[PDB]
Amino acid sequence: NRFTANVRGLTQAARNANDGISLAQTTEGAASEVNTHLQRIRELTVQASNG
Amino acid sequence: AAVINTNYLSLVAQNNLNKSQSSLGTAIERLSSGLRINSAKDDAAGMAIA
């Protein structure tokens, strides 16, 4: 019974960890888009810094 | 794992193919028109200067 409880808990924990992986993936994708923006702002700032 | 309903790898491939196709489209438009700054969305200030 202890083993069954531990096994079910660990499988549910693996599911929770998969959810964490997916959450990190969404955050990572959003941050990548912010990065792609920041490159464009930097390039345009370099352009506009020309007098 | 062994899922059938949703294939994440297919979605990744489609998105990357879309990025490549967008780059190809911009390159083809630049070649055809001969103007790098066409459709001012590309380098908005450049088109004003031009």
């Binding site: 998969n18 959810d19 997916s22 993936q25 | 062994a2 899922v3 059938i4 309903n5 949703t6 979605l11």
Partner: protein, 49 residues
């Protein structure tokens, strides 16, 4: 990413589901057989009379 999130919680893992089905079928045939042999258990009583 959200579609992957949904897959992680909604879609079925065929690798384990098929094994579960196979073990269930094995248990089904075993259960039918053992239920039969349990049904011939009282016939041994119907030997002495």
């Amino acid at each position: 990413n959200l579609s992957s999130a949904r897959s992680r919680i909604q879609d079925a893992d065929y690798a384990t589901e098929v094994s579960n089905m196979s073990k269930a079928q094995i248990l089904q045939q075993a259960g039918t057989s053992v239920l039969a042999q349990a049904n011939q258990v009282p016939q041994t009583v119907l030997s002495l009379l």
